[PDB]
Design a binder for these strands. Structure first.
Ligand SMILES: [Mg+2]
Ligand SMILES: [Mg+2]
Ligand SMILES: [Mg+2]
Ligand SMILES: [Mg+2]
Ligand SMILES: [Mg+2]
Ligand SMILES: [Mg+2]
Ligand SMILES: [Mg+2]
Ligand SMILES: [Mg+2]
Ligand SMILES: [Mg+2]
Ligand SMILES: [Mg+2]
Ligand SMILES: [Mg+2]
Ligand SMILES: [Mg+2]
Ligand SMILES: [Mg+2]
Ligand SMILES: [Mg+2]
Ligand SMILES: [Mg+2]
Ligand SMILES: [Mg+2]
Ligand SMILES: [Mg+2]
Ligand SMILES: [Mg+2]
Ligand SMILES: [Mg+2]
Ligand SMILES: [Mg+2]
Ligand SMILES: [Mg+2]
Ligand SMILES: [Mg+2]
Ligand SMILES: [Mg+2]
Ligand SMILES: [Mg+2]
Lengths: 120, 205, 109, 116, 40, 37, 64
RNA sequence: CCGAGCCUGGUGAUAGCUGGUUGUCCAAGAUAGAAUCUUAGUUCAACUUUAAAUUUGCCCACAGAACCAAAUCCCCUUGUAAAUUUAACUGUUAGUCCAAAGAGGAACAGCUCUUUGGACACUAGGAAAAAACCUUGUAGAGAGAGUAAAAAAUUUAACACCCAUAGUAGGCCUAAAAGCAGCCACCAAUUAAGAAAGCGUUCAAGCUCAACACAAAAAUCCCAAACAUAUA
RNA sequence: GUACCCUAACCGUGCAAAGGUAGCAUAAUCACUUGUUCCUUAAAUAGGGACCUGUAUGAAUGGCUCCACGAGGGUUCAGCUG
RNA sequence: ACCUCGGAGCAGAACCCAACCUCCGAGCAGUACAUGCUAAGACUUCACCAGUCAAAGCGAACCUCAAUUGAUCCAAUAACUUGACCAACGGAACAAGUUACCCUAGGGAUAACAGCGCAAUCCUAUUCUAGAGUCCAUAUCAACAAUAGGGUUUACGACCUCGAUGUUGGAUCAGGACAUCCCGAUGGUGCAGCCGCUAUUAAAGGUUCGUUUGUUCAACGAUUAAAGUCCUACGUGAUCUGAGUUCAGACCGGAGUAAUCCAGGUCGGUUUCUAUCUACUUUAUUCCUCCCUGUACGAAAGGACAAGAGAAAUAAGG
RNA sequence: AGAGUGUAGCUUAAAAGCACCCAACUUACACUUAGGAGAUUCAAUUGACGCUCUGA
RNA sequence: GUUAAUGUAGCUUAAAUUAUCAAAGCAAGGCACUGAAAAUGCCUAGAUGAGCCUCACAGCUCCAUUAACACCA
């Protein structure tokens, strides 16, 4: 029959080759994902149509900050074929309440906290 | 007795209860009788199938025909036909029970040895009549040695290590990468894309 | 020729799993043969059902099967075992939550 | 449960064997079934020596299938008892036989006759 | 094709172009990166 | 149709694509070894 | 799916292929003494225990 | 117009059966089952709708669920916003294909029957056309933009040249079977040629070889046109 | 059981009220059956005449001949006529 | 054949899960006579009805078995209780046959015809050398099997059609396929010649008349260069026919108590349309005779090709 | 002569627990119930009585 | 093809467990001999695969066979 899929823990154990291809650190990892749905929930089972509603990814190509914790990551492991996961990197820090209204999330995955529309 | 003994159409006491067609004794790699025991040359099964009594008479007559019993011997590796296959009587409508037992059948999976040969003889004297028996079998078959069986197995081990394709079938199926387990079987995780039904793709990694 | 066999399912099996809070008299697991044997504060009906005797939390454990000596079938299975052999069965217990009552001050006489 | 490490903790039929010629295969040579006929005209001397060979076998882990008797013949009735033995090693064969020789009480005759 | 081209015993064959191979491959590389960032 | 048929059963197209993506690619050397002494 | 056992399983070291040559409990009291001793040994699974838990003196006595 | 006239009346007979059921706009909305002179139907459940009350619902982690495979159940966190109860009822209970596990049949069916999950009866783009495969769902205007799925690849069979004496028709068995009807032995000459590996003789003889030497076929008419070479 | 140019009454304990007789017969008569043979035709699953395993023929459910008769159903000679 | 209940498999691990699916069973028996009364909490055969389990308490003492069954109706009994193979087992009431004299409402939810799916059956082609063919696998045929293809058959399925897609053969006029029966061109032969047999190639042309039968088939008569296999809604009934096959009447044999039926035979039995639209309405083969010559070939008996000439026949055009 | 050493039969028992013996029910074994015999090799962790082995 | 019954000594009838008897053949006896009549024996895997009990003995299991049924165009 067609059931849900238990993906083994070996698949989510990154190799030291993988830390060189994608620019991640094993020690001190990132805190917040940027989840973006890139596939439809149609022609997918109902246990994936509801997980996508649980993460807020009902719209395609709309990013969403989620924590990098093993309970949010258990939901992202169900629908990893539907989404695209990238780390939210913060070149400057998290925005204060003065820099809250001048932020922008870039396509590199970084959240700049001062966003003028002037060239360098 | 250096000849293939007589294989009977049915057991001595016959099966009285009609068994369902477990077709899963054809699909997948074989586990019983995959290696050589007191022999040198054999007939490998490169695909699954059912041996009727007619195939056993083909193998028994046309191995004992072309043979030196003073220099060669042969043993069976497949059993006598035991699984009952029930045909309904001809020209009947559908339903009304299950048909009566007509004949018996051995299941043979892929990678199974069928007959074995031996004696003071090399392979070229044996590739003659073992490659003509292998062509009459209902599955794709092959005459193998002990040296050419372990060559074709160590070759596929070298195919599985050399390939520049970053994606294999096991990496994609066991991880459920594109959600691809919606179109695969649960058997395809241990089949790894090399077995499709009764058939066997040996060029596939 | 094959008539009969249209029996429905019994709907037996575990009604209250591991760690569930269970009051007294709750049927824990209905069975057909002895799959789970009773343990602490768990009784057996006539039809081998397992009901709970106290208010508590259901625990499933594995312990040593020592049958009754008047149960001549199992004793004759015990005395065929080799010398180091120990049988085990899955037991169902109820860990009783509340105490059976407190001492309350009624009146100063 | 099957998926748990405690699977098969309660299985027991592999500890119970629920269900002959001379076995000399390559080195481990052992007899088949034996019979030990003991005939004497005393029921006291035949019944009591039937116990001791059975007590000698039990103390040496030799398998005793039957310990029955064949009926008497009116000569004065000669009482005959059969003690069925299976399995002796090479070192055990001379030693297990010579003690039953070296304990025959009073004029009882031995036998290592066999089945049928 | 005997009846209903895409269903049944005898279907018309569909084949995999370079479009369909490259479309699955670039979806397989988003997936391999997904397994990386969920591993830490 | 059963899972084991006498003919080669037609694959689902998304199954047919990963049997085309995951095909064996042989290691091609830079210089052909018959062009080297 | 199967998960391997964590510690040693019971009836595993005494497990042989010969069951006629191995000596048995012939009785109920020989089994129960081994049964009571095994229930007191600590095990790696869940049990009931987890939730519901000179020389002159001998010479004088041997003379006496 | 006679298997029982015709007319009026009961009579607006009855029909689980067919047909029909008329302004506008929005919203929610699809498939467990059981009984039944019942399977063309209905009642109850399930699902659905509204209103109301409350507090948990879904996703889930360790631990846990029996002896003779994929998974599920249970389940705090966590992600989330729903669920249960109460009140009031209608309608759907004549499904299809695909993937998977099986059963029946021929390991036939666009076949039949269960289960798990999709899609369809709902829009759009693609697979030529196309209910069911793939992409994609929440609505409007635009003579903006980035994308998703998305175009079938293959073309295959040459081959040696030279040379051949001899113990002996090896014995046996056989009319005789000589290298070759059969069995046993299978040594031995010259540098090198088997007491013969294919043909050939009633049996012989002759020829060689081993040995030196140097995939496709059916019925109105094939079916885009075409194109190996300008930089992913 | 036995007939012996395949032809001896030459024996037949089972029972039923009685056990199909005369005649006719491949019939308008289940199938077998275009039954076996002759005449008819160059050629006959048609038509006519004889033989009976007609094991579902048959005596007012009437049996069998024959004279007449028929917009009845088949077959045929000769003539004739698009 | 079946209809209710239960155990096991399908349904491998919570529950559930169909089948005119596969296998076993049940409609009781035995022992008690506290097999007394009560009552928390639960299970539940996917509803309901029924079914289960049960602590405490009272009272005493110091049930087994998987199924082993049956609602309501108020009466039979003083009461307690008891009563169905209501087995079609959620149960009307104990009510049957038959319809071709049939009728109505419907259904392509559902059959016959046709299409379609499918290819078991059928036909074909290659692979394999067993064996036949004196010897000799492959001139020719071919066992066990194998891999393909076709869509003639017998079937299966039930997808279009029951507010009608009308049928067997025949007539008429045919269109097409080639897997070629004849004519053409070649290779092999166990091909001397003559006859053949087999394969490659070729669909331009051709493919008869009769007796019996409704017959397609089949047998037979006489021929032919040959009297091809098929497909086209088993081609074509708004072109025709109606013998068979489906009616209303009727005998005969049989089945039935009869009404009536057989798929058994036989005699008889209404075949409707004024054309709206599409489409369309003047695109040379063969045989025999003679000659070559009774030559080649053959030991003879026999007996040709090619070339040449003439007679015909059909077809097309006049 | 040297080495290993040494609790009743066995003990990573510390005077223990199993093994063990007889009697009765058992054809007998088994079970059970009644009974039965048992040891730290002696001297201050140490030394010398006994056993096992390697030697002559 | 489905429902239905059937299975016998050398062959058939029967017996409601146990197995009876007329033919068949085996001799002897009367007759010159041969058929009959006697007087005697025999010939039954009760068609069977297992045995719940014990089974022609009676249900599955069955292999032959006997009748009806051999629809529906
Ligand atoms: Mg069941
Ligand atoms: Mg059911
Ligand atoms: Mg089509
Ligand atoms: Mg009305
Ligand atoms: Mg809406
Ligand atoms: Mg109805
Ligand atoms: Mg929860
Ligand atoms: Mg269908
Ligand atoms: Mg939108
Ligand atoms: Mg050579
Ligand atoms: Mg319920
Ligand atoms: Mg009580
Ligand atoms: Mg009813
Ligand atoms: Mg009912
Ligand atoms: Mg009539
Ligand atoms: Mg049809
Ligand atoms: Mg239909
Ligand atoms: Mg259907
Ligand atoms: Mg119709
Ligand atoms: Mg119409
Ligand atoms: Mg051709
Ligand atoms: Mg027609
Ligand atoms: Mg017409
Ligand atoms: Mg008339």
């Amino acid at each position: 029959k067609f059931t849900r899929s238990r993906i083994p823990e070996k698949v989510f154990q990154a190799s030291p080759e993988d830390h060189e291809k994608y620019g991640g650190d094993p020690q001190n990892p990132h805190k917040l994902h940027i989840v973006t749905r890139i596939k439809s929930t149609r022609r997918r089972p109902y246990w994936e149509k509801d997980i996508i509603k649980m993460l807020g990814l009902e719209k395609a190509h709309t990013p969403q900050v989620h924590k990098n914790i093993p309970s949010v990551n258990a939901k992202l492991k169900v629908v990893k074929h539907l989404i695209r996961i990238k780390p939210l990197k913060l070149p400057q820090g998290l925005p204060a309440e003065e820099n809250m209204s001048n932020t922008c999330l870039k396509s590199t995955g970084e959240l700049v906290v001062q966003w003028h529309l002037k060239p360098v | 007795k250096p000849k293939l003994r007589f294989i009977e159409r049915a057991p001595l006491v016959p099966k009285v209860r009609r068994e369902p067609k477990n077709l899963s004794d054809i699909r997948g790699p074989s586990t019983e009788a995959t290696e050589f025991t007191e022999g040198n040359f054999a007939i490998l099964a490169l695909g699954g199938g059912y041996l009727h009594w007619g195939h056993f008479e083909m193998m028994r007559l046309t191995i004992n025909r072309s043979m030196d019993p003073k220099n060669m011997f042969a043993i069976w590796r497949v059993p006598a036909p035991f699984k009952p296959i029930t045909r309904k009587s001809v020209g009947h409508r559908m339903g009304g029970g299950k048909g009566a037992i007509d004949h018996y059948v051995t299941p043979v999976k892929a990678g199974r040895l069928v007959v074995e040969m031996g004696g003071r003889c090399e392979f070229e004297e044996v590739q003659g009549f073992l490659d003509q028996v292998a062509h009459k079998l209902p599955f794709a078959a092959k005459a193998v040695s002990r040296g050419t069986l372990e060559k074709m197995r160590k070759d596929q081990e070298e195919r599985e290590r050399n390939n520049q394709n970053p994606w294999t079938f096991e990496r994609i199926a066991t991880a459920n990468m594109l959600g691809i387990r919606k179109v695969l079987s649960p058997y395809d995780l241990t089949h790894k894309g090399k077995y499709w039904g009764k058939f066997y793709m040996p060029k596939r990694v | 020729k094959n008539l009969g066999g249209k029996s429905s399912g019994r709907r037996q099996g575990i009604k209250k799993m591991e760690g569930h809070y269970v009051h007294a008299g709750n049927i824990i697991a209905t069975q057909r043969h002895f799959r789970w044997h009773p343990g602490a504060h768990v009784g057996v009906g006539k039809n081998k059902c397992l009901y709970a005797l106290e208010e508590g939390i259901v625990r499933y454990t594995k312990e040593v099967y020592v049958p009754h000596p008047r149960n001549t079938e199992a004793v004759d299975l015990i005395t065929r075992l080799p010398k180091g052999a120990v049988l085990y069965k899955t037991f169902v217990h109820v860990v009783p939550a509340k105490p059976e009552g407190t001492f309350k001050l009624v009146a100063m006489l | 449960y099957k998926t748990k490490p405690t699977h098969g903790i309660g299985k027991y039929k592999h500890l119970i064997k629920a269900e002959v010629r001379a076995i000399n295969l390559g080195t481990d040579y052992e007899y088949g079934v034996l019979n030990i006929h003991l005939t004497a005209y005393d029921m006291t001397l035949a019944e009591s020596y039937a116990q001791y060979v059975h007590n000698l076998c039990n103390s040496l882990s030799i398998k005793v299938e039957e310990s029955y008797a064949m009926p008497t013949k009116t000569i004065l009735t000669t009482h005959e008892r059969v003690v069925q033995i299976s399995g002796l090693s090479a070192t055990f064969a001379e030693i297990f036989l010579e003690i039953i020789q070296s304990s025959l009480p009073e004029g009882v005759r031995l036998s290592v006759k066999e089945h049928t | 094709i005997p009846g209903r081209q895409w269903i049944g015993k005898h279907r018309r064959p569909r084949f995999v172009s370079l479009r369909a191979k490259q479309n699955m491959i670039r979806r397989l590389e988003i997936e391999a990166e997904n397994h990386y960032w969920l591993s830490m | 149709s059963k899972a084991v048929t006498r003919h080669r059963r037609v694959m689902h197209f998304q199954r047919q694509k990963l049997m085309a993506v995951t095909e064996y690619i042989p290691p091609k050397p830079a210089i052909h070894p018959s062009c080297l002494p | 799916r199967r998960t391997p056992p964590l510690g040693p399983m019971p009836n595993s070291d005494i497990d042989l292929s010969n069951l006629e040559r191995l000596e048995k409990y012939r009785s109920f009291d020989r089994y129960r003494r081994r049964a009571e001793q095994e229930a007191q040994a600590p095990h790696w699974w869940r049990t009931y225990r987890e939730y519901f838990g000179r020389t002159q003196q001998l010479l004088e006595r041997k003379q006496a």
